[PDB]
């Protein structure tokens, strides 16, 4: 019975996530940015493709403290004025909100995943193509746009949203994770990663990719930044 | 025989040649190389028929050949990879150390 | 054409004249004829075992 | 820092090599209508990377093409409307790359820039003249009548505008290809077939004789027979006279048939009781190869 | 042809004129008309003996 | 709730059997050989005529 709204300036606003530590495991929840539609006077998710498809009234957020400076806030979907809404009654996991729903009756902590832009493979990482190997235990993945200092190792987990052509000839979209076994091409910004699993069809295109939490450590140009959490507004039927 | 033609007549076949001259003369008066690929050797059998419209678009195979010609044209201008990373050796050949700073 | 629809209107009015046939006027688009508690109702909330 | 040398590396960078694709839908066919690796741009990325020795992800082409787009509002389908609708649904406005009247980039050009986004391309592939060709062939009532100078100037400066947003990168142009419209409107389910008559020509002399000329497609006209159909001048949908002309009736690089004064006068009598001259004519030629009829486009000039 | 469909439209409007027949507009594709708790719901979880 | 997998080299692999001694009698069970189909990445019985018609994942 609680809803939390605030303003933040992450490096990857479309990929901003929050981890919830239930006494069972560590679920991950994605906070899609919300923009205030003026004509309907309601808060709507900016992500029209893989958003929450939820609307909230203007009362859910009230601004009293000093707002985040514009120059310190990134732009997503052509807009810099956006807020993140956390609803405990719609805690759907998954990158595209297709995962299991978290039970909000037992939560031990709520951790925000603040990270730098060049974290992991980098902000500019993208997938070129995917195809299954002739071997019956793995498949190949091509990744580009990787910063030079990045390194990869076996056992890493990668989240990706991609569209594939079904065996019936109709287009299909699905999301899942992959496990890294080996890769080639260190330092050339192009990786030929071999991963386990099976592809249910021919690759068409990729919509999302994270490539975070790499086992191997790497240097980065030192830079200092300030993370802002402004106007934390809490409302709902639960005890406040 | 001289009475047979390989290309059926179309009302717009003349302006397409006229525009082709405009593009061709533009290449010779610019700085860079602007000749992508040749498509004048393709016949109506190389086009997919659409009912009620005609044959306007290339086949998947014919367009594939066009892309291959585009790749060769760019490679002639740029024969080698122009970019180079700061690192050269494998990950096993570099130490990972921390410093107080450059100075 | 030839005023075919005009003839039908005149005949229908005269033949069925002398009796009341006012249909009820009810708006089903109102909130009364819709279940309250939209997508945010506890009805749509997931049931826990 | 290296194992054997003490130099310090502390800066990261990306070696992406984007390539920009923009223009008419004739280039859009490379990305659409298929999947990996059968798509056209897949082979372009495959062949290019192998030659350079880099991985498959070294080249990153970007699609910014749009179907039925013109270089200027003059050749646009809807010069007046501004709303952008690449799907041609509802109001098919915009769809022009540049507006030479106001010297302003068009919505189609802005859409291509939006596709590029954060990436910095190093090469441009262009092709567009499909829409300008048909518009120039039919000027219509468009007050800014299409012209070569307008097309040249719009195409000249649109490249400069792209060169303004990015570096002085080379740009390659795909030459304009041919396109054939449908032959018969009443039969919208038949494609172009071999033996189809084409290049219909009509000629006359001062005496009054009428000559019909056409050229065969895909086969020797001397091997197949032909038949000429002439429609009634009064009822254009009803055939009036017809005759069969055999093969080898070809000269001067054309297949000719003789319709002289002594031929059309007898057929004119039933229509009009006087030998009125036949200034106007609508007629069709149908091939008779392997007992198959292949009617051609009507000639009504 | 011969404007056959045009005649039908004119006749239908005139004959049934004078009464309201606005059909309800309801979108069944929304989440309200769909059962919550997708493939990840405990409903699809295997029942243990 | 247990599954056992192993490799063996009997003289008659199609006729390899295992006896189970229930407190009632001595049942006999036949172990048909299983081959790993590469295209579907699953273990399938090689006997297509009188096999178990069962599929198992590679993890087994």
Residue numbers in the entry:
A (entry chain LA): 122 to 361
B (entry chain SA): 3 to 105
C (entry chain TA), E (entry chain TB): 2 to 50
D (entry chain LA): 422 to 722
F (entry chain LB): 122 to 181
Q: From the publication, what sentences describe this entry?
A:
In stark contrast to the N4 transcriptional program, which has been studied extensively 17, many key questions about the role of phage N4 vRNAP as an ejection protein and its part in the DNA ejectosome remain unanswered. vRNAP (gp50) consists of three predicted domains: a likely membrane-spanning N-terminal domain (NTD), a single-subunit RNA polymerase (RNAP) domain, and a large C-terminal domain of unknown function (CTD).
First, the portal undergoes two major changes: the collapse of the barrel helices beyond residue 667 20 and the narrowing of the portal tunnel from 33 Å to 25 Å due to restructuring of the tunnel loop. Interestingly, the tail tube appeared sealed in both the full and empty particles. Surprisingly, both the N4 mature virion and empty particle have a density for the tail plug, suggesting that the plug is not lost in the environment after receptor binding but remains tethered to the tail complex, available for reattachment after ejection proteins and DNA have been released.
